[PDB]
Enzyme design. Structure first.
Site, PDB file in Angstrom:
ATOM      1  N   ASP A 209      -4.587  -4.989  -7.129  1.00  0.00           N
ATOM      2  CA  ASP A 209      -4.074  -6.351  -7.064  1.00  0.00           C
ATOM      3  C   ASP A 209      -5.010  -7.514  -6.716  1.00  0.00           C
ATOM      4  O   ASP A 209      -4.573  -8.666  -6.705  1.00  0.00           O
ATOM      5  CB  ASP A 209      -2.747  -6.407  -6.282  1.00  0.00           C
TER       6      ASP A 209
ATOM      7  N   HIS B 218      -7.008  -0.183  -4.322  1.00  0.00           N
ATOM      8  CA  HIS B 218      -6.061  -1.230  -4.705  1.00  0.00           C
ATOM      9  C   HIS B 218      -6.529  -2.109  -5.869  1.00  0.00           C
ATOM     10  O   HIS B 218      -7.691  -2.496  -5.947  1.00  0.00           O
ATOM     11  CB  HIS B 218      -5.609  -2.000  -3.458  1.00  0.00           C
TER      12      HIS B 218
ATOM     13  N   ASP C  27      -2.347   5.318  -3.245  1.00  0.00           N
ATOM     14  CA  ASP C  27      -1.815   4.165  -2.511  1.00  0.00           C
ATOM     15  C   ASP C  27      -1.022   3.442  -3.593  1.00  0.00           C
ATOM     16  O   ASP C  27      -1.503   3.320  -4.722  1.00  0.00           O
ATOM     17  CB  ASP C  27      -2.932   3.249  -1.989  1.00  0.00           C
TER      18      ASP C  27
ATOM     19  N   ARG D  18     -15.234  -7.955 -11.531  1.00  0.00           N
ATOM     20  CA  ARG D  18     -14.791  -6.604 -11.855  1.00  0.00           C
ATOM     21  C   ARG D  18     -14.074  -6.605 -13.180  1.00  0.00           C
ATOM     22  O   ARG D  18     -12.854  -6.501 -13.239  1.00  0.00           O
ATOM     23  CB  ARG D  18     -13.850  -6.106 -10.771  1.00  0.00           C
TER      24      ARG D  18
ATOM     25  N   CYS E 122      -0.454  -8.104  -1.104  1.00  0.00           N
ATOM     26  CA  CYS E 122      -0.626  -6.952  -0.211  1.00  0.00           C
ATOM     27  C   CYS E 122       0.338  -6.906   0.965  1.00  0.00           C
ATOM     28  O   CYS E 122       0.806  -5.834   1.338  1.00  0.00           O
ATOM     29  CB  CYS E 122      -2.029  -6.929   0.354  1.00  0.00           C
TER      30      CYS E 122
ATOM     31  N   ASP F 203       0.800  -1.211   0.000  1.00  0.00           N
ATOM     32  CA  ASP F 203       0.000   0.000   0.000  1.00  0.00           C
ATOM     33  C   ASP F 203       0.833   1.262   0.000  1.00  0.00           C
ATOM     34  O   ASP F 203       0.404   2.284  -0.513  1.00  0.00           O
ATOM     35  CB  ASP F 203      -0.886   0.055   1.233  1.00  0.00           C
TER      36      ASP F 203
END
Lengths: 360, 360
Positions: free
Chosen positions: B242, B240, B191, B259, B344, B107
């Protein structure tokens, strides 16, 4: 691009001029003590956290407004930081402090080419100084300029030598000669005013506020286009190089007679003209809370043949006139007290010219 | 140079793995509300400023220590951030807040070539998150790496839409489709996890925490060597990329079926293999304070043929195995609750390989 400046003398087109409003005396911590004359230590001890004398600030405000009028008359676009109350107490996970001011754009911003760089700073009271300049910087960014913020230090205790044995400026000069400063090499830190630009070559000094890591960060960030050189002086200015070695033209530099450069021979070999200015005439009873009487040589060049110089400092005015340089006299005697002359109170955003080498 | 990573899949040699210690629930402000599922809004409302459940943290600590042991077994050097109490309340001239954690290096840090970049962040509770990583970064800097800190935002009220009309994630998805996010274009913010690397091409999404100014700052800072592209998705992850579009090899990307990418045709035209992973099997009663069940696809590649994947997520393990990719199963079910999977919880510092183009 609104931002474009490769040196200290090309024809000036746009400049940022600081503000004297709401300037606060910084708490008397170790790094403040190491960057000020003992004569004023009790003032900081007592006035820490309060506004600088308001009657004095009012006079400085007036002097700076006139300086801006003159700049506008000389064809320069003037931008000013946002008015902010510096008395606000902030707290990071590492320390707590009240602020200083946004009087000296040269201490925090440096323009290298089309890039505006925000210095990290080294004083706890100047941690959030950048806030006053963001409106301007974002505007230039929207207009195409590159924008960089050097790594902001934690300014934790580890960055300072809590027991720095300074009891007088004389002690400081000795320690400095020993390579001992109030700031350690814990993390990078620097004030932009410890750097002075000459096209492809930028000169810097390790001072009480600029450490080798800070200089190395700049060196690494700007390579290969620019070369950052480290120079040193005898009995140096605790912070900032522009009242010690002020470069005023291609191959011309004003060298403070009291703080000779150890590497002066590098400049002589390059065929540079080293000019030593006459002594300042400023009254010794005039308060200079920061910096020294040598603010007289802290001139700002509008171009190679036009210099903005202090109205009271006649002897240095004469020196410039004999060199065929037009003097634009402005009185900033009260603004001087805050710690700076013309070069300190400004940050040149745009000068007309290209990137060149002068060291050959 | 200890730092050198151009993509998400070359042979991994050094990585930073986050810490779950002292993680604090962030105060329930507008930007937190816009990045979390309603089911948890009352938890934030009540627990704001307190430590996340300590019994849960203890389990996460254990899972992450095992993950590090496995990484070491797989020949990867592991660095960890410094232990810090995130409950400390700090105050800038613009706001006051308690912290979050240093659980997700992805992040805040992104490595592009030999340069480590600290993201500005967009949450008030993550303003000082960089402090946990400075010891590591300074070490790499001393060893030759380039170090950059993107401009730290003021995070003043102007950066947020105080009245963001979100009453459910469904509202958010609609607003997002309208181009309406909780963050304005007041100043740059982002981020690092909203960026994903593929050599000369880096992909980013405008999210609740990454605005166009933030993306433009990255684009301008990295040009001309790298090209930053903006992609968008249907019903996007608030923050984010990923767990939505995870690039796992030269021309191979995992695309979250829920998505879909609006620009998927750009990738098809480049001859990229778009793999849609099977659904996650994680229990719906398991708390995921941040992120979603799609953490299953938030994998970390040790190399093109070795993937670190969740031990519980058998269906996606099978998908990789059918593709000839060795699965290194690790259980981080409790660490997941903090908002992240393998990608992450890490920041790849060094991968063996060179800079190349894969978009052709």
């Amino acid at each position: 691009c609104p931002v474009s400046s490769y040196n200290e003398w090309d024809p000036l087109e746009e400049v940022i001029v600081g503000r004297a409003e709401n300037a606060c005396v910084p708490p008397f911590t170790i790094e403040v003590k190491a960057n000020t004359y003992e004569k004023y230590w009790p003032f900081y001890q007592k006035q820490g956290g309060h506004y600088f004398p308001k009657d004095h600030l009012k006079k400085a405000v007036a002097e700076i407004e006139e300086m801006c009028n003159i700049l506008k008359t000389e064809g320069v676009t003037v931008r000013r930081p946002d008015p902010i109350d510096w008395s606000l107490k902030y707290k990071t996970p590492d320390f707590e402090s009240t602020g200083l001011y946004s009087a000296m754009p040269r201490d925090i911003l440096i323009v290298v080419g089309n890039e505006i760089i925000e210095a990290p700073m080294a004083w706890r009271s100047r941690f959030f100084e950048y806030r006053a300049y963001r409106s301007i910087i974002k505007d230039y960014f929207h207009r195409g300029a590159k924008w960089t913020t050097a790594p902001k230090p934690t300014m934790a205790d580890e960055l300072y030598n809590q027991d720095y044995p300074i009891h007088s400026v004389e002690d400081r000069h000795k320690l400095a000669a020993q390579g001992k400063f109030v700031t350690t090499e814990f993390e990078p830190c620097f004030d932009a005013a410890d750097f002075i630009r000459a096209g492809r070559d930028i000169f810097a000094q390790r001072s009480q506020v600029t450490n080798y890591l800070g200089i190395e960060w700049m060196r690494r960030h700007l390579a290969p286009d620019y070369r950052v050189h480290i120079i040193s002086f005898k009995d140096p200015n605790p912070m900032h190089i522009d009242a010690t070695f002020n470069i005023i033209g291609p191959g011309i530099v004003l060298s403070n007679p009291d703080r000779p450069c150890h590497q002066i021979d590098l400049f002589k070999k390059a065929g540079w003209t080293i000019i030593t200015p006459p002594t300042p005439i400023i009254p010794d009873d005039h308060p200079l809370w920061m910096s020294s009487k040598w603010l007289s040589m802290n001139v700002l060049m509008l171009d190679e043949k036009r210099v903005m110089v202090d109205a009271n400092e006649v002897p240095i005015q004469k020196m410039f006139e004999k060199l065929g340089i037009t003097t634009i006299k402005v009185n900033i005697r009260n603004a001087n007290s805050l710690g700076g002359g013309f070069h300190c109170w400004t940050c040149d955003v745009r000068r007309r010219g290209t990137l060149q080498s002068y060291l050959d």
